Amino acid sequence: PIVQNLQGQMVHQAISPRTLNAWVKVVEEKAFSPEVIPMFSALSEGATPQDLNTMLNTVGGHQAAMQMLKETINEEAAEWDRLHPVHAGPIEPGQMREPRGSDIAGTTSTLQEQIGWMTHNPPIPVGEIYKRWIILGLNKIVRMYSPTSILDIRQGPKEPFRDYVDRFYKTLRAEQASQEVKNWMTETLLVQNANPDCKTILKALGPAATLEEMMTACQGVGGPGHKARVL
Amino acid sequence: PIVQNLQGQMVHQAISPRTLNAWVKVVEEKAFSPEVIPMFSALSEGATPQDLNTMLNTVGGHQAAMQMLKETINEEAAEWDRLHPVHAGPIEPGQMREPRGSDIAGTTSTLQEQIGWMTHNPPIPVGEIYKRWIILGLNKIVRMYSPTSILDIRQGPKEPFRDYVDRFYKTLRAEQASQEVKNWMTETLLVQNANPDCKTILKALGPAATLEEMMTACQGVGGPGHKARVL
Amino acid sequence: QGPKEPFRDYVDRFYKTLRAEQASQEVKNWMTETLLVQNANPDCKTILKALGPAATLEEMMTACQGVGGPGHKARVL
Amino acid sequence: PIVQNLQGQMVHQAISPRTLNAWVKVVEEKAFSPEVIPMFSALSEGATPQDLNTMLNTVGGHQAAMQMLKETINEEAAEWDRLHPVHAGPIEPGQMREPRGSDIAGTTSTLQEQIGWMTHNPPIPVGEIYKRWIILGLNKIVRMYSPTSILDIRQGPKEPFRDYVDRFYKTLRAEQASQEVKNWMTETLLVQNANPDCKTILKALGPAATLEEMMTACQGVGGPGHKARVL
Amino acid sequence: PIVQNLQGQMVHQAISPRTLNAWVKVVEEKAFSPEVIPMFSALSEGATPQDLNTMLNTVGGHQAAMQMLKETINEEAAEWDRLHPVHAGPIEPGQMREPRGSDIAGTTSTLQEQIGWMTHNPPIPVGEIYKRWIILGLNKIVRMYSPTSILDIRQGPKEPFRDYVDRFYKTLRAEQASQEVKNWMTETLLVQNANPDCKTILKALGPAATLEEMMTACQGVGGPGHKARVL
């Protein structure tokens, strides 16, 4: 990564062994789950394309998904390469050149080139651009990998809203469907198999009311919904 | 390892147990597998030749491979010695000598003498050169001890892509990872013995098939690796 | 198409007849668009539809595997 | 055809019954196989689109391959028509006009006009381009009507090895393979399925072996008389 | 081949039909064999590398020998590239381009360049050089592929001095054997198994008799394949 005494960027500093251990743990344990992208964003602060390549190369597991990410990166970099009519590595004195698609992915450019772009005024932030391409490819894998199926889960009589809402929201979050579809889904699949006494109050209040009121209702029936880590 | 706060303040600081335990963990746990090499590359940038020897000698697992690595880098060191038969004339008074291959490997050189070359004007990056020799030797060992053969590894009659692809891509990175070979195998070899439901869709799309389109298919099959595990 | 006739044998026989015979340019274009496939064996015809409705000739001439007799099965030198 | 001359700049003459018979003879005698492809270049040098159309439509044997060859020419003509957007309106009395795809293949152009382009100063080399399209199509039909690529050319279990090296190299010329593939196949797939004596020698010799050593190997196995020593 | 010597303008013309028909006939009749080489040399006079490659590449038979020839040509060309490295090759406005060994072999050159080299001042005789390399490679193939050896030309059980004389000189045609060995074999092995009355006089005549006198000798005393008593 690149550091300086104040907030800016100037000089290179090595990647931390704790960052490497922590990064491997989330990818190996949780796999392609949406919170891994915030964790990747948090751990990749100040990172160069060489550091981002070190992070991708270090992970042993999920080898096909990493290839799908790499093919996504190759395509997105090629899309940038065709879009922007950047010239070769050679440059006139006192200018730092402009990066091509493969320079951003570190294939045709070393660490020094990456530092010269990121430390400039106004900078070219090749780590941010590569990080966006990685996030774009990770989201494609999450869309394939996460969905558990909101349609295929059903609500029994033993779980009212307070208990059911936790597993429903976890399943809904895994589902990658549009926000407009999710607005309909929220007022429909949470009343679909609800018992009629609960169904009536949940239908009346709806998703425009506070979740607290919905949780509170149906207190004399079904599972508890307030125990969190306790069964 | 060598530490340098500002350019021309180069100093040495003793080995970190966090770095050493990370190395000892990966070498015993993950053995001769391709992810150990970039992990080793990440931890070794500030390492001296002396530190690289300490990392090699502290291992107790897999003794035959360690002796093969030492023999392989002795040959790499000899190629440097053959190229450079030291100074043209005698050495200058008080001058740091031209480095030989044994000196780069750290066997014939002191800690002061080896840091001398990395201080030197023009600089000689002896730890980086030794680390390059270790990477070239380690790839040969990782490839030799490999549990799989790239010709053998393919989609069997059971797999709905997902079990096979991870094995194939782990094998492919151990190899040279040729794009021509990957294109030939993906079109031809890897569909040859493949699952009949997956074989028909590959034949149906043909030049419109690719890993993204295939790995998002074969969902009714229920074969190896259809679980899609998330927490 | 004959009962165990290969697709490569069938198209050669069809073209040889076509190519000798005379018909309009439009009618001959229609004959190669759908008449040839209609007069193929039902398994071969199903394979040709499953391959794609407008399928390229290289891919069509390398399709219908196992529908014919043993001579077209598993080609080798 | 059109050929060079010393009393005129070039001289045009009709196709010969000898040259046309020579082309028909190779197609009947030796079929579509790699041997006829450079023969077509040497025999058809200086040819007009009319001479090439005469050669194309005179051949009667291999009717499916002949119709497939025309399909490649139709795609190639379409590709040229698509590539070049020609000048519209009337053809002015002093111009020769830019040819479209169908003009290159002689459909929409009379012989005087075909000769016109080819003999022009500077020229448009229409007969050279159409000859190129035909040889490109010959490779496509040869890949289809050749028995199989090098991958399924597996050595039999008792072979004297001499017919196998002819069979492999006879197949190999009809394949577009890289140098890496040839060395990988020669190490891997030659050894995998073979006569027991021959694989044992070839594995012992290893991938460092030269072609003369390989050509020598299995000595006296195919030797004069009827040979049946080894079971 | 190049044409129109001493006419006041040089011209190029493609391989004649009879040149092809004769080459096809010789290979079909008697393959790559010692008497083929002077006939090939006669047809290769004034040939371009494109003509020579066309002759090699239109032969569909003898493909292991063809691969052995091409590898030997590649090897000979590689030596010529070491002997004659090109400094006058690519340049900004274009130039004649000095031949490397690959240019002579026809792998980095094309027909227009080859015509230009043979029509240069001084002329560069690329076909003469390439023909010599083909002759050297054909001689190596002849030694490999001939099943006879100088041990095998020992005299049959009771033979006349007729057929085995023809075998002996035919075998020695393909071998670089010393003349003094031929004198020893003539008075030992070549007369070894003939009847005592004929055998003793033939050794008594020995190398101090002409082949005519040796063949004239033993009138009515020859072996059962030809007694030599008839008029």
Q: What is the DSSP string of chain D?
A: -EEE-SSSSEEE-PPPHHHHHHHHHHHHHH-SSTTHHHHHHHHTTT--HHHHHHHHHH--SSHHHHHHHHHHHHHHHHHHHHH-----S---TT------HHHHTTSS--HHHHHHHHHSSS---HHHHHHHHHHHHHHHHHHHHSS--GGG-PPPTT--SHHHHHHHHHHHTTS---HHHHHHHHHHHHHHSS-HHHHHHHHHH-TT--HHHHHHSSTTTS-SS------
The amino acid sitting at A75 is E
Taking the Cβ of residue E9 and every Cβ of chain D, the question of whether any pair is shorter than 8 Å is answered with yes
Nearest alpha-carbon partner for A68 in B201, B199, B186 = B186
Cα D141 from Cα D146, distance rounded (Å): 8
Q: Chain C contacts of B204, Cβ < 8 Å?
A: 50-52
Single-letter amino acid code for the residue at B164: Y
Cα angle value B90/B92/B98 (rounded, 5°):
75
Using the beta-carbon criterion (under 8 Å), do D148 and C12 form an inter-chain contact?
Answer: no
Q: Which residues contact B16 (CB under 8 A, 6 or more apart)?
A: A17, B1
Six-digit token pair at D1?
């055809």
Contact: D215, E12; criterion CB under 8 Å: no
* Token pair for B228: 């899609």
- Whether residue B180 lies within 8 A of chain D, CB to CB, comes out as yes
Rounded to 10 deg, the angle between the B111-119 and B49-58 helix axes is 130
Does D151 touch chain B if contact means CB atoms closer than 8 Å? yes
Task: Using DSSP, state whether E3 is helix, strand or coil.
Answer: strand
Cα–Cα distance, D76 to D133 (Å, whole number): 7
Least CB–CB distance from A58: residue in B38, B45, B210: B38
C-to-D residue pairs, Cβ atoms closer than 8 angstroms: 32
Q: Which residues of D touch E59 (CB under 8 A)?
A: 35
Please report residues of B whose CB lies closer than 8 A to that of D192. 151
Place of tokens 């199989």: D148
Contact residues for E151 (Cβ-Cβ < 8 A; gap 6+) = none
* 3+ Cβ–Cβ pairs closer than 8 Å linking A and D: no
Q: Examine residue A122 and say whether the peptide bond preceding it is cis (omega within 30 degrees of 0).
A: yes
The sign of the CA dihedral B157, B162, B163, B165 is: positive
Tell me how many degrees the CA angle D121-D127-D133 measures, rounded to the nearest 5. 135
- Please give the span between the terminal C-alpha atoms of chain E, in angstroms, as a whole number: 52
CA distances from C41 to C3, D20, D64 (A): 7, 39, 18
Measured CA to CA, the distance from residue D11 to residue D4 in angstroms comes to: 6
Sequence-separated (6 or more) residues with CB below 8 Å from residue A66: A56, A59, B169
| Sequence-separated (6 or more) residues with CB below 8 Å from residue A224 | A162, A163
Judged by a CB distance cut-off of 8 A, whether residue A153 touches chain B is: no
Which residues, including other chains, have CB under 8 Å from residue D181's CB and lie 6 or more apart? B180, B181, B184
The pair of structure tokens assigned to A191 is 């009343």
Q: Do A88 and A82 meet the contact criterion of CB atoms below 8 Å apart?
A: no
Nearest residue to A69 via CA among A143, A18, A126, A3: A143
CA-to-CA dists, residue E121 to D80, E103, E118, E124, angstroms: 40, 18, 9, 8
The interface residues of chain D toward chain E in range 108-147, judged by CB-CB distance below 8 A, are: none
The two tokens of residue B54 are: 């300490």
CB D22 within 8 A of CB E17: yes
Residues on chain D touching E57 (C-beta within 8 angstroms): 34-35, 37-38
Which of E30, E22, E33 lies closest to E55, judged by CA?
Answer: E22
The H-assigned helical ranges of A146-195 are: 161-174, 179-186
Number of other residues whose CB lies within 10 A of the CB of residue D180: 12
Q: Is the peptide bond before E122 cis (omega within 30 degrees of 0)?
A: yes
Q: Which residues of chain B make contact with A63, given a CB cutoff of 8 A?
A: 165-170, 173
CB atoms D165 and E14 under 8 Å: no
Q: Residue E107: how many CB atoms within 10 A of its CB?
A: 15
Of E17, E53, E67, the CB nearest to D22: E17
- Give the closest residue to A1 by CA, choosing from A50, A42, A40: A50
Find chain B residues with C-beta within 8 A of C55's C-beta: none
3-state secondary structure chain B: CEECCCCCCCEECCCCHHHHHHHHHHHHHCCCCCCHHHHHHHHCCCCCHHHHHHHHHHCCCCHHHHHHHHHHHHHHHHHHHHHCCCCCCCCCCCCCCCCCHHHHCCCCCCHHHHHHHHHCCCCCCHHHHHHHHHHHHHHHHHHHHCCCCCCCCCCCCCCCCHHHHHHHHHHHHHCCCCHHHHHHHHHCHHHCCCCHHHHHHHHHHHHHCCHHHHHCCCCCCCCCCCCCCCC
Residue among B178, B185, B187, B190 with most chain D CBs within 10 A, to mutate: B178
CB A156 within 8 A of CB A117: no
Q: At what resolution in Å was this solved? A: 8.6
Compute CA distances B119 → A91, A116, B9, B114, B127, whole Å.
29, 23, 10, 9, 12
d(CA E65, CA E53) in angstroms, rounded, equals 15
Residues B117, C11: Cα–Cα separation, whole Å? 75
Tokens 């080609």, located at residue: C75
Q: Which two tokens stand for residue A136?
A: 């774009």
Q: Which chain E residues contact residue D215 at CB under 8 A?
A: 64, 68, 144
Q: Do chains C and E touch (3 or more CB pairs under 8 A)?
A: no
Beta-carbon count within 10 A of A158 CB: 10
What span, in angstroms and rounded, lies between the C-alpha atoms of B28 and B58?
A: 11
Q: Pick from D33, D57, D67, D141 the residue to mutate for testing the C interface (most C CBs within 10 Å).
A: D67
Write the DSSP symbol of residue A105: T
Pair A198, A218: CB distance under 8 Å: yes
Distance, first Cα to last Cα, chain A: 44
